[PDB]
RNA sequence: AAGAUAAGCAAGUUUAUUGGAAGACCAUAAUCAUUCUGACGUGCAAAUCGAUGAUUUAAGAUGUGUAUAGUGGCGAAAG
RNA sequence: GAGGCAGUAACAAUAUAUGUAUAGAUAUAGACUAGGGUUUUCAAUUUAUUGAAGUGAAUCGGUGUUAUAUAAAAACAAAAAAGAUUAAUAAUUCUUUAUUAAAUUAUUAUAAGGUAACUUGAUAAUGACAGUAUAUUUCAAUAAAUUUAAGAUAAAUGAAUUAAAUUUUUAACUAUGGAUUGUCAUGAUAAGAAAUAGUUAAUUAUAUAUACUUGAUAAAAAUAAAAUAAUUUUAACCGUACCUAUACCGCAUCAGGUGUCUUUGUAUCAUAACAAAUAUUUUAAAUUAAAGUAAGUAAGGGAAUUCGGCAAAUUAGAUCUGUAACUUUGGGAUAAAGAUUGGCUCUAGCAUGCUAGAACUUUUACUAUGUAAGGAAUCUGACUGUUUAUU
């Protein structure tokens, strides 16, 4: 038989981040723009705000 | 808005001298500007090639200068033909 | 010596017709033939040799 | 010594000379009318050329200052003088600007080929 | 460990586009595809002429004439709005001659 | 950097966004060769190895085809 | 032709009491072209010697067109894919379903319809052409659910880990209409907006639509017709084994050099590193020399050593405050100088996976890997760039 690497270690660690544990100030190594883009957050906001104005007119 | 007196020539940074960047600000202002179409009357004429000016709406090409839509030596010879 | 743009396309092809003929006067070049699936003249002649052996 | 740079540059022009267009206009007996078709750009020169159409034949010419696509011009020995028209030399009054002069009659053109120079 | 199967030359030119398809038995294969073609355009107004079949000119001769043309004079070359300017222009230039 | 939008104060002028120009800044793969005057020095090798360094959308790197020959060719120039 | 130095320098040296196995150890791997030419496979005798066998094409390359009087196996060009067989060939052999071209057969429309954009047998079209940035998330891949199977644990565990499959409206144009309206950004309209009714298409990431840089505006030529069904001792010539570095070039089984592409899992910017997959490999001694080539640590002093701080050491990621003289008004600047960083349990926002705050606890938190020493002056060159292949 062949071997395949197990992901039981990584499935646990991804669950604690889903509660927001391991994203401290001491475990960041990139900038604020690298972890979250500032351009995409403006496109998310201006597309939703343009949708809700059409509904209030109709 | 961020610049006090340099304007469009702030892309060059802190090189090439002082008076060489003054000569770039005169020419680059008139190249990037859009003009009125003499045919259709709309403001959509832009430059794409040296000596060729074309409109976006009516799509009619005009001959002209290198960096300006009209040439100062080009307009004086139109007046003497009107008389 | 002034020509139209439309007449100049004729003089190019007439120039490129002479260059096709002067190739066959150069020594030591392989001969240019037609493509095989379009040249119907060669397919008739080789088939004539083919059934001649059958007799 | 060796052969210097100046002589070695001229013999490099005989192995591969430079190529340009040399645009000339035809000759016609009486005044005809032609239309401007399009404006193009060549590799070597800076001034744009123009393609005019006389008697369903397309030639090439140097573009004058105010010229747009579809305009009509006249060619002949006695055409009226205006922007872009081509007339004889005796008709124009003193003080104007011309930009293609043939040395002799029935020639294409010799003087004033580049852009900006009149 | 699975291996993609490639057949042919490996240069990425214009005519060598490939895609990856999965077989029923479990192989992986890089199959070649046809060359990309574009829409025909008007000779004057330069708009996209739809309803004409866009393909390579070898296959384009095999189509029917209704798939190559439009039921209109100058149907293969022009857009159908440019002909409205032509017919009015060609008629009016005749009536100018008879006066002068 | 141009370009564009708003909110204030009153011909204009401050504040906040959007936008993404430049022979601008920094790294991996790839490239070069400053220092240790390190290793080796009948060597792995008729010019290599290790650490340390310089480099990034261009006046770049590279396969194939045609052209240039010894009082001659090619050269951002050291014979 | 044969000595001394001399069996000296210099190189090679994994474990098992019974084994076609159980273990250890080092190295990423696989395909096209240039070069090599039988090294391929098998049998017999000991990386050798001899002897047999092996390369199957209408749709895979060449043979065709040209680069402004001899030029392309990566530019242009009629057409196919699965599934199995051999000791060795397989888009070429065999089975199943297709496609192109040419010769002979059977049959026949010469025009209708829509106000319009257009629909149906009803010709005259093209090959054919820069670079960069942003927005689409097509495919594909992840993630979830389900159904069959596998391997292990002294024990224990709301049921862990691995494999296969099945699923998870927009742009043009036309007719009415008569003055408003969009994008992440720049806007569009009396040369007719929104709103209605309709006709075409949606180019599959090497794509589509916009924008931006230029005294650079981004190749040639051969090449065309069409309805439905059928037939064929119809589709010529050449190459198709094997190697990608111990099967190339450097006199060699040489730590050098050599065009293109593909490649699984963890990895909160990446990088670095580790594991998969696949390929190779058999037996001297040792708690003890000196002097070497590498890697570590050091009480007290801190450049007194030296031509010279040559070599080594200190600093470093990310968040928050703060930032001078000078100036070609753009810069100097990431100047300099300070403070914070773990684990667990919650609270609060909306964009739903990112960011602030609070409580508890400890031999205190970027630091395994990666990661700027700083300041003040003088001479010379404006800057990006290039150069004596080997001092
Ligand atoms: Mg740069
Ligand atoms: Mg040394
Ligand atoms: Mg010779
Ligand atoms: Mg000297
Ligand atoms: Mg040894
Ligand atoms: Mg043998
Ligand atoms: Mg094989
Ligand atoms: Mg097969
Ligand atoms: Mg073969
Ligand atoms: Mg083979
Ligand atoms: Mg190779
Ligand atoms: Mg080697
Ligand atoms: Mg010892
Ligand atoms: Mg000490
Ligand atoms: Mg101490
Ligand atoms: Mg001292
Ligand atoms: Mg001393
Ligand atoms: Mg040092
Ligand atoms: Mg805390
Ligand atoms: Mg310098
Ligand atoms: Mg040197
Ligand atoms: Zn206009
Ligand atoms: Zn049109």
Instruction: Output the CA torsion sign for A28, A29, A35, A38.
Output: positive
CA distances from C53 to C41, C43, C45, D107, D117 (A): 20, 17, 14, 72, 82
Cα gap C1→D64, rounded to integer Å: 23
Three-state SS annotation for chain E: CCCCECCCCCCCCCCCCEEEEECCCCCEEEEECCCCCCCCECCCCCCECCCCCCCCHHHHCCCCHHHCCCCCCCCCCCCCCHHHHHHHHHHHHHHHHHHC
- Asked if D73 contacts D52 with a C-beta cutoff of 8 angstroms, the reply is yes
Q: Give pairs for B39-42: CB < 8 Å, separation 24+.
A: B39/D68
Please list the helix, strand and coil fractions of chain D in percent, rounded to the nearest 5, in that order: 10, 25, 70
Instruction: Output the CA torsion sign for C13, C18, C24, C29.
Output: negative
Ligand 2 mean position, distance from CA A53 (Å): 77
Backbone φ, ψ for residue D35 (5° rounding): -120, 145
Q: Which residue is nearest to nucleotide G31 (CA to C1')?
A: E6
- Positions of strand F less than 7 angstroms from a protein CB: 1-4, 16-19, 21-24, 67-68, 72-75, 77
Question: Which chain C residues are Cβ-neighbours of D26 within 8 angstroms?
Answer: 2, 4
Q: Please name the residue ranges forming H helices in D27-89.
A: none
Question: Which chain B residues are Cβ-neighbours of D83 within 8 angstroms?
Answer: 78, 81
Question: Which chain B residues are Cβ-neighbours of D64 within 8 angstroms?
Answer: 63
Q: Which residue is nearest to nucleotide G124 (CA to C1')?
A: E76
| CA–C1' gap, E23 and G66, in angstroms | 41
**Pairing state of beta strands B52-55 and D32-40?**
unpaired
Helix (H) or strand (E) holding E31: strand E28-32
| CA–C1' gap, B39 and G323, in angstroms | 57
- Asked if E56 contacts E38 with a C-beta cutoff of 8 angstroms, the reply is no
Cβ atoms within 10 Å, residue B61 = 22
Selection from B42, B66, B36, B63 nearest residue B52 by Cα: B63
Instruction: Output the CA torsion sign for E55, E58, E61, E64.
Output: negative
Cβ atoms within 10 Å, residue A44 = 9
Cα gap B60→D50, rounded to integer Å: 14
- Asked if D82 contacts D88 with a C-beta cutoff of 8 angstroms, the reply is no
Method of determination is cryo-EM
Is the distance between the Cβ of D15 and the closest atom of strand F smaller than 7 Å?
Answer: yes
- Asked if D58 contacts D37 with a C-beta cutoff of 8 angstroms, the reply is yes
Specify the 3-state DSSP secondary structure of D75.
strand
- Asked if B62 contacts D67 with a C-beta cutoff of 8 angstroms, the reply is yes
Closest Cβ opposite residue B63 in set D64, D82, D97 = D64
Ligand 16 mean position, distance from CA B19 (Å): 51
CA distances from B24 to B1, B7, B8, B11, E90 (A): 19, 10, 9, 11, 51
Cα gap E37→D55, rounded to integer Å: 37
The b-or-e profile of D71-89 (16+ CB within 10 A means b, else e) is eebbbbeebeeeebebbee
Three-state SS annotation for chain A: CCCCCCCHHHHHHHHHHHCCCCCCCCCCCCCHHHHCCHHHHHHHHHHHHHHHHHHHHC
**Pairing state of beta strands D58-62 and D49-53?**
antiparallel
Resolution as reported, in Å: 3.4
Specify the 3-state DSSP secondary structure of C18.
helix
Cα gap D101→D108, rounded to integer Å: 8
Cβ atoms within 10 Å, residue D62 = 19
Cα gap D93→D70, rounded to integer Å: 28
Backbone φ, ψ for residue E7 (5° rounding): -130, 125
Cα gap B33→E79, rounded to integer Å: 33
Is the distance between the Cβ of B10 and the closest atom of strand F smaller than 7 Å?
Answer: yes
Say whether residue C8 is in contact with chain D using an 8 A CB cutoff: no
Cα gap E51→B1, rounded to integer Å: 50
Cα gap B3→D13, rounded to integer Å: 51
- Asked if D93 contacts D80 with a C-beta cutoff of 8 angstroms, the reply is no
| CA–C1' gap, A1 and G196, in angstroms | 68
Length of chain B: 83
- Chains B+D touching (3+ CB pairs under 8 Å): yes
Cα gap E30→E41, rounded to integer Å: 33
Say whether residue D58 is in contact with chain C using an 8 A CB cutoff: yes
Partner chains of B (3+ C-beta pairs under 8 Å): D
- Strand G contact residues in chain C (9-28), C-beta within 7 Å: 12-13, 15-16, 18-20, 22-23, 26, 28
Selection from B81, C51, A7, B57 nearest residue D96 by Cα: B81
* Dihedral in degrees, nearest 10, Cα atoms C34, C39, C45, C46: 80
- Asked if D61 contacts D52 with a C-beta cutoff of 8 angstroms, the reply is yes
Specify the 3-state DSSP secondary structure of D33.
strand
Cα gap B9→B16, rounded to integer Å: 11
CA distances from E68 to C11, E9, E77 (A): 33, 35, 11
Distance from CA of residue E46 to its chain's centroid?
A: 14
User: CA E52, E55, E57 angle in degrees (round to 5)?
Assistant: 105
How many angstroms away from the CA of C14 is the closest CA of chain D? 20
CA distances from E28 to A3, D30, E15, E31 (A): 22, 75, 21, 9
| CA–C1' gap, B21 and G312, in angstroms | 49
Closest Cβ opposite residue D58 in set C1, C2, C6 = C6
Selection from D88, D94, D40, D93 nearest residue D67 by Cα: D40
Sheet holding D72-75, edge to edge: D58-62, D49-53, D32-40, D72-75
Cα gap E13→E20, rounded to integer Å: 17
E33 CB-near residues (< 8 Å, 6+ apart): E17, E18, E19
D72 CB-near residues (< 8 Å, 6+ apart): D33, D34, D35, D36
| CA–C1' gap, E61 and G166, in angstroms | 43
Is the distance between the Cβ of E46 and the closest atom of strand G smaller than 7 Å?
Answer: no
Specify the 3-state DSSP secondary structure of C6.
helix
Closest Cβ opposite residue D60 in set C1, C5, C7 = C5
Selection from C30, C11, C7 nearest residue C19 by Cα: C11
- D47–B81: do the CB atoms touch at under 8 Å? no
Backbone φ, ψ for residue E74 (5° rounding): 50, 50
- Asked if B46 contacts D52 with a C-beta cutoff of 8 angstroms, the reply is no
């Amino acid at each position: 038989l062949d071997k395949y690497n197990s992901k039981g270690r990584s499935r646990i660690y991804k669950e604690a981040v889903a509660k927001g544990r391991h994203m401290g100030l001491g475990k960041r190594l990139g900038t604020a723009n690298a972890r979250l883009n500032k351009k995409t957050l403006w496109i998310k906001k201006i597309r939703v705000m343009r949708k809700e104005l059409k509904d209030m007119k109709a | 808005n961020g610049t006090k007196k340099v304007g469009i020539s702030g892309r060059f940074g802190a090189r090439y001298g002082s008076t060489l960047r003054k000569r770039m600000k005169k020419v680059l202002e008139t190249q990037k500007k859009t003009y009125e179409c003499r045919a259709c009357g709309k403001t959509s004429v832009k430059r794409d090639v040296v000596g060729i000016w074309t409109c976006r709406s009516c799509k009619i090409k005009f001959a002209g200068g290198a960096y300006a839509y009209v040439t100062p030596a080009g307009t004086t010879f139109n007046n003497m033909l009107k008389q | 010596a002034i020509f139209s743009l439309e007449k100049q396309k004729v003089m190019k092809q007439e120039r490129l017709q002479k260059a096709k003929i002067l190739r066959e006067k150069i020594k030591g070049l392989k001969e240019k033939k037609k493509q095989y699936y379009l040249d119907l003249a060669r397919q008739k002649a080789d088939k004539l040799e083919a059934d001649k052996l059958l007799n | 010594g060796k052969v210097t740079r100046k002589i070695r540059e001229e013999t490099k022009k005989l192995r591969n000379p430079r190529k340009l267009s040399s645009p000339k206009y035809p000759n016609f007996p009486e005044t005809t009318q032609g239309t401007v078709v399009d404006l193009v750009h060549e590799r070597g020169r800076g001034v744009p050329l123009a393609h005019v159409k006389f008697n369903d034949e397309i030639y090439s010419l140097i573009a004058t200052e105010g010229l747009y696509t579809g305009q009509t011009i006249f060619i002949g020995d006695n055409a009226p003088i205006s922007i872009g028209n081509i007339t004889k030399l005796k008709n124009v009054p003193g003080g104007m600007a011309v930009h293609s002069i043939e040395y002799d009659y029935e020639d294409g053109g010799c003087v004033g080929m580049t852009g900006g120079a009149y | 460990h699975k291996i993609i199967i490639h057949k042919g030359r490996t240069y990425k030119t214009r005519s060598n586009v490939r895609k990856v398809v999965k077989t029923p038995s479990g192989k992986l294969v890089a199959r070649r595809q046809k060359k990309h073609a574009k829409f025909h355009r008007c000779h004057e107004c330069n708009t996209k002429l739809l309803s004409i079949a866009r393909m390579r000119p070898a296959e384009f001769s095999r189509q029917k004439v209704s798939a190559r043309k439009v039921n209109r004079p100058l149907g293969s070359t022009t857009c159908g709005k440019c002909v409205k300017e032509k017919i009015i222009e060609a008629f009016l230039n005749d009536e100018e001659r008879i006066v002068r």
